[PDB]
Every structure is written in C-alpha cells, then in structure tokens.
Amino acid sequence: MTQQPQAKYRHDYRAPDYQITDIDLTFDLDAQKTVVTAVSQAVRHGASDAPLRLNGEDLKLVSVHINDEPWTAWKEEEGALVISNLPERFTLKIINEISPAANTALEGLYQSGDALCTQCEAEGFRHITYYLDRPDVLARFTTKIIADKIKYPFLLSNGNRVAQGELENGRHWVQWQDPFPKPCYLFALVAGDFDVLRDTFTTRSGREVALELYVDRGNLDRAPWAMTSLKNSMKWDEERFGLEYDLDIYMIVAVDFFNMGAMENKGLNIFNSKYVLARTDTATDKDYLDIERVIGHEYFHNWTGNRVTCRDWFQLSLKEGLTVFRDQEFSSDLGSRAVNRINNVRTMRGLQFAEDASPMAHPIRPDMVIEMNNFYTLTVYEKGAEVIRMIHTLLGEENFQKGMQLYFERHDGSAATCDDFVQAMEDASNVDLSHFRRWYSQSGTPIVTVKDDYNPETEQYTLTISQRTPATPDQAEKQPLHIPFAIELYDNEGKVIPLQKGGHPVNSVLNVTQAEQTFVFDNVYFQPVPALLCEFSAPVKLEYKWSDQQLTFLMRHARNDFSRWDAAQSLLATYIKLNVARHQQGQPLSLPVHVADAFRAVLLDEKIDPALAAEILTLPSVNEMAELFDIIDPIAIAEVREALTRTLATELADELLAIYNANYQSEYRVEHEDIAKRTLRNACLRFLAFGETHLADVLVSKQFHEANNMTDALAALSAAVAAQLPCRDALMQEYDDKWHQNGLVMDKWFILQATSPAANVLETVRGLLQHRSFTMSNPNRIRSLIGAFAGSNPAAFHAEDGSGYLFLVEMLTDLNSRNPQVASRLIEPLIRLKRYDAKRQEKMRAALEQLKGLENLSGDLYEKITKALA
C-alpha cells in the first residue's frame, strides 16, 4: 500500500494560507537550555477563518504574542501550534526553549564536541522554533546570538555581522543579517571555538569575497586543500555557467558530528569534517577528489538551491539532480572526464539500479513520503543527475546554458518545481520535452533491447530497439520513455562509419520514444561493430547479444575512453555469471585465454591513458556484480571476485609487476596525472597481492612501510587485509597505534576491519564496538564499522546462520532511539530481502518483524520496514 495516515502526497500540495516575510531571531544559547525568541512578520493569504498552523517538535513553549498582545486563541497539537482569529497582517512573537545537549538525532540545534551547530534540512528548523517549516515560505532573516564568551568566542549565522556587543557575566552577542529571502531549511547557526583559515576570492566582475574556513583548534594544517577547492568551485561556476557569488563572506564550518556529508546554508555552509580535512599523510587521492566534489557541490547550490529553491520536498531533485550534475561536470572538467563518467556509471548500475528494484523504489520526483529524510537517495541524486545529463544530451551545451539562464531569469528569488525547470529548458531550446517529463514521474529502470541486421546488398544497418519498464513495488503501470540512445559504428580498421540515411547526415543520438521502433542507416560500407548507449546516454539496462570479439575489438579501437571500459565490463559480466553458476556447483573458476589476453593487452598498451587502464583493471565491486543476477548469491559473488582476481594475478603476473615498477613515483603530489599513475600502480598491486604469497607479502609490507602518503599506505594495507597476507595483523596494529586519536583516519581502518574476508569477521567487528576509536554517538564511526559490514561485506552479512542479520538488529535497536537517520541508512541491506534465496529471505523477514515490534519505532524505520514486509 501507497495509503498511510502518516504519508504526505505530492498531489496534495497547496499554497500556504499564511506567508512570513521577515523573521528576527534571538538565541540565548546554552547547551543544556537555549531560549529562542522569534519575531515574524506575517501575512494571511487564505480565508479569514483559516488558522495559522506552525510546525514544532520537542519545543517548550513559553509565550505567544500577536502584535504585542499575549494570545489566548491557540492550541498545541501533535507537532503543531495552531493559532486562530488572526488579522490579515501581524507580528507573531514566540518564545520557546530547547535543549541542544539532549539532541542525539543531530537535527535542529545540537552539540558537536564543544561546538553548537544546526542542521535544518529538510525539516529541522521546527526543532528550533514554531514556524512554517516548508520551503515555499521564504523570509528575510536577522539573527542575534548571545553566549558565554570563553566557551563560544565565534558566533556565526547566515550573511553579514550587523551588530555586536559585550554584556555583564562574561557574555557577548553578535547579530547577523542575510539580505536574500530564504526558506528556513537554509538557516544556520554555529557557536564555538575554532582555528580559522582566511582567504579571499575576487569575482569576475570584481566583487571581493572574504572566505573563512572554521575548523577545530589544531586542524589548520588540514584546511588548505578545501580552501583551494572552494576557490576552484567559484572560478569554475563563473567560467562554465556564468554564475558569481552574491554575498561578501563565504563561511564553511567543519564539524565532526554530522549525519550527512555537508549542507549549503546560505553563506554559512556546515560540512562533515570528512569532506574538509586532508593532508598527504591522512587522506588518500580519492579523499582529496571527494573533498573537491563536495566543496563544489555545496557551492553550486548557491544558485541551484538557494537563489532558486524548492516549492515542496517532493521537488528535491530540482536542486539535487541539477547540483549533482554540476558537481560531476566540475570534477570532469578539472580532472579526468572519462574516469569521472566511469565511476558515476558504476554507482548508477551497481547501487542505484538495486534501489530502483527495491521496496523503496521511487521516481526522482516522489509521489508519497512518510519521512523526508528517507528520500536523500541514490535515485533523487544520481538518477536525478542522469536525467539532467539526458536533457544536456538532447539540447547540447549552448541550448542547455540558454535554458539555465531562462530558469534563473524566471525563478530567481522564488521556490520552483521540477516541471518549471524542464519548461525553461524547452522554451529556451525549442526542443519538445513533453514526453521527456515522464522520467520525473516513473520509477524503475527501463530495459532497452537491441537487435541488429546488416544487409550487404544495400549496405544498410538496421537496429530494432524496444523498451519496457517492469512494474515496481510503488507503481503497477509503466509506459515508454524518451530515451536518448547514442551510438557509433566502427569499421574493420577501427574508424567511425558516418551515420546517414537517404544521403543526409543523421545525428548520433537516437530518439527511442516507442515500445518498439526500427532505425535504418545507409552507406554502411562494412559490417559494423557498434558502440551502443555511448557514455551511458540514458540510465537504462541494455540487452544486446555481444560476441566476445566485438567487445575486445571495442576495447582496442573505440574512440571514447568510456566505451573501451564499458566493453570490458560487458566482457567480464559474461564470465562473472558463468563463474557464479560454477561456484554453486563447487567447480573451479573457468576463463578463456582470449579474455585474459584482452586484459594483458591493456596492461601493455603504451598509448592508453593510465587512468583508463586503471579502471579497466579494477574489477566490478560485489554491488555491481549483484546487478547481473535476479537472485543474488552473496557468498558466490564474493568468492568469484576473489578467484577471478587470483586467476588474473597468476596469468598476468609478469606484466603486473612490470607495470607496478614502471609507475613508481618518488615524489607525492596531488595532480591528476600523478593520481592516474598511482591508481594504475595500486590496481596492479591489488592483483599482485593475490598472487604468489611470498612476493605478495614482500611487495605489500614494503609499500606500506616506505609510503610517504596515505594513498600508497592504504592501498597496501587494504591489499593485506583482502588477501589475508602474513603481514596483515602487524600492519593493522601499527596503523591503530599510530592513528587511533584521529577518527577520520580510523574510519578507513574500521572499513577494512568490517570488509575483511576472514572467517571470524563478525566476532572481530563486535569486539570493535569497544575499540578506543569507536563511538556509537558519532555517525562517521557508525557508518565506517557497522555500515560497511552490512553494506560492503555481503558474504559475512549474509552468513547462512543469520548472525549478520542479528547483529544489525541489535545495532538498529540502539540507533532507532539515538539517531533514526543513521538507523535508516543502516537498515537498507535488510530491505533488499526479496533479491535473496528463500532461506535468507525468511531470516531477513524475521529480523524486520523484530524491528517492526520496537517500542517507539521511528517514522524513518517504519517507512522502510512496512514497504519491505509488504
């Protein structure tokens, strides 16, 4: 059932009965008890008898005044203060109390170490005061903060400092104003003691912006890369999208206790310190690139999110899909576009596709939501970005930029919908996107089937392409989509055959708009090898009967790097499926020599970009492998990935070592070419680790001990864990002894513990709940130990005895009361039960039923559990 008393429905959206135009807040801050005074200027738009319904959660109400009159015509109901008999225009004054120190959910105003900080997206501001906590209510904020000066020397909020003072009893105050109207999800406050990295950026039209990065005392050495990436973000948004920052100060605060990654609060972003702090001996290349991504992402929200915001939470993809697309384009333009595209596609096929088949399936613009924090999803974010990328593919850059400009010109200063965005793109480009809009309302992954025919008499190549989407748990009815289907045809020399029809050029993006259609190309002078769905031109599963030689030919000749990688993946997939079937019969790994040879050729190809080689030589993860099957056998998948690694290691031993030694770098630098060389080197080391044991142990221990950087040390440590080499325990103990007082660094070690293939991994993981560097109160530690076990150690999580499931239930029973958002993230592997065999399925079901009986089950878990048990 898509019918629930607690569910909200998109189709029920109505404009609010009241608006707020200006709000003046005062915080009398204290960790045990904070007093909030909120003075709002309000305007009734609806009927004279409609009351004002303000959202509020766990607030202690002290007083309510309307135009300075203490009010009697109100009542408190569950999650609301309902005020009747209001004039048309009035001043509302609310005083209420809250308690940051009791806030373990980390929603609203809470404590991160000694700091106080906020998280208001999506519906967190209602935990601070009674408000119209909905993003179509935009208001101008003024925020005054009063606090103990020794404990909270920095008092920050959105915008600029407009006033400040010193009081008796060691207190002081600062007031802030932000001139841009905003929804309350974008409000922020920080109070604490910090080191501050200060810099400036001058915008293209000459506006000077003060940049300020606040980090815990002692962490300034790990701040410069984030600062540099902020500057890069600003410069890039200017160059690519013509967008400049619109305020005088840009503040970022790094906090250790944060449920998500980061938050785009206007002028005052708040970041998980995971996505800020880096130095060469604490952070890997991938960490540096993630910091760049996330810094960029929150900056890009300043236009796609802040200057134009969301009419209601069902429109989340309006800002997230677009902003992810922007962070991907940023990463891609500065770094390796091919490697970016490859990794985004790995995430789509391996994690997103699984969600879109799960009980939690939803369209990128959802129709029904119980707990909005459950919809910060792979679908809304990653599939949302693929939908924007499809629009880009259909329109081309120049038309796409015209559409962006019309979107802002229409909607700057307001809350918009997905439909308003698509309409701006259509009106600016004159490309019809009516059919295309179905991508917003339909869930599930389309399956595109392609058959082909070559007619040597006429030199025609005919593609017959059909599509369908299977029913999903949320929708019984599906229809065809407007699928942009990019192709390239290759001749026997590896050259592109021009596409034509009736002696006229044809565009290489086919418009696959029907359940079935046929495309006929002329002057196809040789029987072509096709590259199909180039650059993953739509988020679909492809069914095409590839021969192994078509694939190996594409690996050698395809023009774009991505299609070379994509062909390698299709070549492995066949043999992954073969060998999972073999594993279930107790048979050894079987692989044809010609498949090993194709990978040999990549290793020895002198012209190939090392970043591309490295991705071709990174086997699909267990998640991407799971996509290939209707019923997942988690034990066979893990064992096949390991056996395939062992087999290629034996077969390619000499070549692996040679490429490993050739890519040795004496200097460490954070530069894309050097990163590419290192990623290839370490991909070779991974295979070598699974080869002959004595050489493995020597290469790995030596890389670890001689590393001048976390990238090379961690690649070695990870390989020792994964291949269970003799040096493993000693390297793990060394890392612990060196880094235990550094939580971000320890997260890597917890993930390696959690993902270990050793036989007693669950026992070791349970014992790590008492480790000196673990705490249940910190979301990063939880995700690194518990989340990695459940989500990335499928063979242990899915042990036949059900011990993995019980472990997760015990953890969830704690997190359901402590931090429901983290609990809901962690439950995800249990809700996939219908992908598994009957026996596993029945144990997963019993685990879910046990959680369903928790006293005070959170809405967050309830939504996922009821869908899963349906």
Ligand code: MET
């Ligand atoms: C609701 S927290 C998510 C923060 C921000 N919208 C991001 O995209 O990372």
Ligand code: MET
């Ligand atoms: C890959 S083009 C060839 C299509 C089909 N095998 C034919 O011979 O007509």
Ligand code: MET
């Ligand atoms: C994943 S390393 C194996 C476990 C390690 N020896 C420990 O007990 O901490």
Ligand code: NA
């Ligand atoms: Na308003």
Ligand code: NA
């Ligand atoms: Na936003």
Ligand code: NA
């Ligand atoms: Na690039």
Ligand code: NA
């Ligand atoms: Na990768």
Ligand code: NA
């Ligand atoms: Na249209």
Ligand code: NA
């Ligand atoms: Na065919």
Ligand code: NA
């Ligand atoms: Na593929």
Ligand SMILES: [Zn+2]
């Ligand atoms: Zn975002």
